[PDB]
Design a protein around this motif. Structure first.
Motif, mmCIF file in Angstrom:
data_model
loop_
_atom_site.group_PDB
_atom_site.id
_atom_site.type_symbol
_atom_site.label_atom_id
_atom_site.label_comp_id
_atom_site.label_asym_id
_atom_site.label_seq_id
_atom_site.Cartn_x
_atom_site.Cartn_y
_atom_site.Cartn_z
ATOM 1 N N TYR A 125 2.430 12.347 0.080
ATOM 2 C CA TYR A 125 1.103 11.840 0.405
ATOM 3 C C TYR A 125 0.376 11.297 -0.819
ATOM 4 C CZ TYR A 125 -3.493 11.126 2.401
ATOM 5 O OH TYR A 125 -4.655 10.503 2.804
ATOM 6 N N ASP A 126 0.472 11.988 -1.960
ATOM 7 C CA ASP A 126 -0.196 11.527 -3.193
ATOM 8 C C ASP A 126 0.154 10.073 -3.491
ATOM 9 O OD1 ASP A 126 -1.366 14.031 -3.976
ATOM 10 O OD2 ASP A 126 0.580 14.633 -4.813
ATOM 11 N N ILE A 127 1.441 9.770 -3.397
ATOM 12 C CA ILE A 127 1.919 8.434 -3.679
ATOM 13 C C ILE A 127 1.292 7.380 -2.773
ATOM 14 C CG2 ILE A 127 3.941 6.957 -3.645
ATOM 15 C CD1 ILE A 127 5.554 9.324 -4.664
ATOM 16 N N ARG A 128 1.241 7.659 -1.473
ATOM 17 C CA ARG A 128 0.653 6.724 -0.530
ATOM 18 C C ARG A 128 -0.802 6.490 -0.909
ATOM 19 N NH1 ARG A 128 3.775 7.411 5.159
ATOM 20 N NH2 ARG A 128 5.259 9.044 4.528
ATOM 21 N N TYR A 129 -1.482 7.569 -1.263
ATOM 22 C CA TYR A 129 -2.889 7.506 -1.627
ATOM 23 C C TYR A 129 -3.188 6.684 -2.880
ATOM 24 C CZ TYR A 129 -7.491 8.871 -3.280
ATOM 25 O OH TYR A 129 -8.775 8.806 -3.769
ATOM 26 N N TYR A 130 -2.489 6.967 -3.977
ATOM 27 C CA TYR A 130 -2.750 6.252 -5.225
ATOM 28 C C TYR A 130 -2.399 4.774 -5.211
ATOM 29 C CZ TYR A 130 -4.146 10.577 -7.499
ATOM 30 O OH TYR A 130 -4.826 11.726 -7.851
ATOM 31 N N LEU A 286 10.789 11.843 -0.806
ATOM 32 C CA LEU A 286 9.832 10.740 -0.921
ATOM 33 C C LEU A 286 10.298 9.441 -0.271
ATOM 34 C CD1 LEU A 286 8.992 11.176 -4.706
ATOM 35 C CD2 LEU A 286 7.597 11.972 -2.785
ATOM 36 N N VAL A 287 11.566 9.380 0.112
ATOM 37 C CA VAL A 287 12.100 8.163 0.709
ATOM 38 C C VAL A 287 12.100 8.177 2.234
ATOM 39 C CG1 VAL A 287 14.028 6.549 0.704
ATOM 40 C CG2 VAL A 287 13.587 7.963 -1.307
ATOM 41 N N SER A 288 11.075 7.579 2.828
ATOM 42 C CA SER A 288 10.971 7.508 4.282
ATOM 43 C C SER A 288 11.194 6.062 4.700
ATOM 44 C CB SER A 288 9.585 7.955 4.741
ATOM 45 O OG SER A 288 8.588 7.071 4.260
ATOM 46 N N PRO A 289 11.534 5.834 5.980
ATOM 47 C CA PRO A 289 11.768 4.478 6.486
ATOM 48 C C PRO A 289 10.565 3.569 6.240
ATOM 49 C CG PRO A 289 12.663 6.058 8.006
ATOM 50 C CD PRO A 289 11.804 6.837 7.030
ATOM 51 N N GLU A 290 9.358 4.107 6.396
ATOM 52 C CA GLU A 290 8.157 3.300 6.171
ATOM 53 C C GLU A 290 8.030 2.900 4.696
ATOM 54 O OE1 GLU A 290 6.187 1.871 8.159
ATOM 55 O OE2 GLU A 290 6.262 2.910 10.077
ATOM 56 N N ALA A 291 8.356 3.815 3.791
ATOM 57 C CA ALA A 291 8.284 3.516 2.361
ATOM 58 C C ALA A 291 9.245 2.373 2.039
ATOM 59 C CB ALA A 291 8.649 4.762 1.530
ATOM 60 N N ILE A 292 10.438 2.436 2.629
ATOM 61 C CA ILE A 292 11.470 1.416 2.428
ATOM 62 C C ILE A 292 11.036 0.063 2.974
ATOM 63 C CG2 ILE A 292 13.805 0.655 3.057
ATOM 64 C CD1 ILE A 292 13.591 2.923 0.958
ATOM 65 N N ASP A 293 10.409 0.064 4.144
ATOM 66 C CA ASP A 293 9.959 -1.187 4.737
ATOM 67 C C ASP A 293 8.921 -1.844 3.834
ATOM 68 O OD1 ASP A 293 10.103 -2.929 7.198
ATOM 69 O OD2 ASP A 293 7.952 -2.554 7.191
ATOM 70 N N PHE A 294 7.996 -1.037 3.321
ATOM 71 C CA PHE A 294 6.943 -1.537 2.442
ATOM 72 C C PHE A 294 7.498 -2.129 1.140
ATOM 73 C CE2 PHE A 294 3.772 -0.515 -0.993
ATOM 74 C CZ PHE A 294 2.848 -1.498 -0.653
ATOM 75 N N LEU A 295 8.334 -1.359 0.454
ATOM 76 C CA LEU A 295 8.943 -1.792 -0.797
ATOM 77 C C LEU A 295 9.731 -3.080 -0.606
ATOM 78 C CD1 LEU A 295 9.722 -1.347 -3.768
ATOM 79 C CD2 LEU A 295 11.641 0.041 -2.948
ATOM 80 N N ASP A 296 10.439 -3.159 0.514
ATOM 81 C CA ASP A 296 11.265 -4.315 0.812
ATOM 82 C C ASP A 296 10.455 -5.608 0.865
ATOM 83 O OD1 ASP A 296 14.002 -5.180 1.438
ATOM 84 O OD2 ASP A 296 13.174 -5.738 3.394
ATOM 85 N N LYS A 297 9.250 -5.516 1.418
ATOM 86 C CA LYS A 297 8.364 -6.661 1.544
ATOM 87 C C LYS A 297 7.616 -6.989 0.252
ATOM 88 C CE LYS A 297 8.113 -5.988 6.516
ATOM 89 N NZ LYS A 297 7.468 -5.278 7.654
ATOM 90 N N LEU A 298 7.787 -6.152 -0.763
ATOM 91 C CA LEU A 298 7.153 -6.420 -2.049
ATOM 92 C C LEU A 298 8.152 -7.076 -3.010
ATOM 93 C CD1 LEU A 298 5.015 -3.230 -2.802
ATOM 94 C CD2 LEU A 298 4.194 -5.479 -2.145
#
Length: 327
Positions: A125-130, A286-298
């Protein structure tokens, strides 16, 4: 190439807003701020935790090394333009030494916890927040026609107890003007986007989104320099070994980019490595499907394909940070 958003900000605005070479500095008194202890070093400056002899309030003292006054006025005007925005370090005063003539900028105070000790303790959660908080900062400066050009962990101060964040050091930032050709020697090597490495000079705000992408990857995968190259030519090779070489060719062909013989041979041909192959017991929490989708689009070679700071804030990955912010 032209930015896909905020492209006309400095076109509609009076030259006074972006003409920094005409800035006339109204210095203050160095005889008003005292140095307490060095908290940061740098090729262009030294940072000190200081006190304000007046209010007694703490502050940050930045002492600039010797450089052309053009680069000094640039950083000053941009900080004046951005003062007030969310999560942007606030400039309070500007002073100089009478004999040496050494410039110094006075900033709000922020504890600042060394990222090499902080990041390892951050929770999912910290990561999503910052990151969400850093994106507010970037969307804001882009909306004001400014590129930071030096996004990296060192330029993001974090007070983890108060959960406060600030984007700092606008010493390489510039005003965005459609079609203009800028210098590709900006940012720190590990966060330089493909455009700076293949020499595409008319880049824009999307450069900051690649840098952010590198930061994000570093955090979810628990591997700081995510792209760890020893030099610029080596930096591009590292990127190409993860994203694949086919995507690079499309990019190069689209913008009709040359790419000298050495770097090209040096790069060679590589297939793309799916993001999941970077997952390990040390970072699976820390590696969730949503995190991967986000990183991929960056992390997309093509700067125009990357998500804008505004689109990123609305990605489902920050779903809970938004709801918590709403109420």
């Amino acid at each position: 190439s032209k930015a896909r958003v905020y492209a006309d900000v400095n076109v509609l605005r009076p030259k006074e807003y972006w003409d920094y070479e005409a800035l006339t500095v109204q210095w203050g008194e160095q005889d008003d701020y005292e140095v307490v202890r060095k908290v940061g070093r740098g090729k262009y400056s030294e940072v000190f935790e200081g006190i304000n002899v007046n209010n007694n309030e703490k502050c940050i003292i930045k002492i600039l090394k010797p450089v052309k006054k053009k680069k000094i006025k640039r950083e000053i005007k941009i900080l004046q333009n951005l003062c007030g925005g969310p999560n942007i370090v606030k400039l309070l005063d500007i002073v100089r030494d009478q004999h040496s003539k050494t410039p110094s900028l006075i900033f709000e105070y922020v504890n600042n916890t060394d990222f090499k000790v902080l990041y390892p303790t951050l929770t999912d959660y910290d990561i999503r927040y910052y990151i969400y908080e850093l994106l507010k900062a970037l969307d804001y400066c882009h909306s004001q026609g400014i590129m930071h050009r030096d996004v990296k962990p060192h330029n993001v101060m974090i007070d983890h107890e108060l959960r406060k964040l600030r984007l700092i050091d606008w010493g390489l930032a510039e005003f965005y003007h459609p079609g203009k050709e800028y210098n590709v020697r900006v940012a720190s090597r590990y966060f330089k986007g493909p455009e700076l490495l293949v020499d595409l000079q008319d880049y824009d705000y999307s450069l900051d989104m690649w840098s952010l992408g590198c930061m994000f990857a570093g955090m979810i995968f628990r591997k700081e320099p995510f792209f760890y190259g020893h030099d610029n030519h080596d930096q591009l090779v590292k990127i190409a070994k993860v994203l694949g070489t086919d995507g690079l060719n499309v990019y190069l062909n689209k913008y009709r980019i040359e790419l000298d013989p050495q770097l090209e041979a040096l790069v060679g041909r590589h297939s793309r490595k799916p993001w999941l192959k970077f997952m390990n017991a040390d970072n699976q929490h820390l590696v969730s499907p949503e995190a991967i989708d986000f990183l991929d689009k960056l992390l997309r070679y093509d700067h125009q394909e990357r998500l804008t700071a505004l689109e990123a804030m609305t990605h489902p990955y920050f779903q809970q940070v938004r709801a918590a912010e709403n109420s």
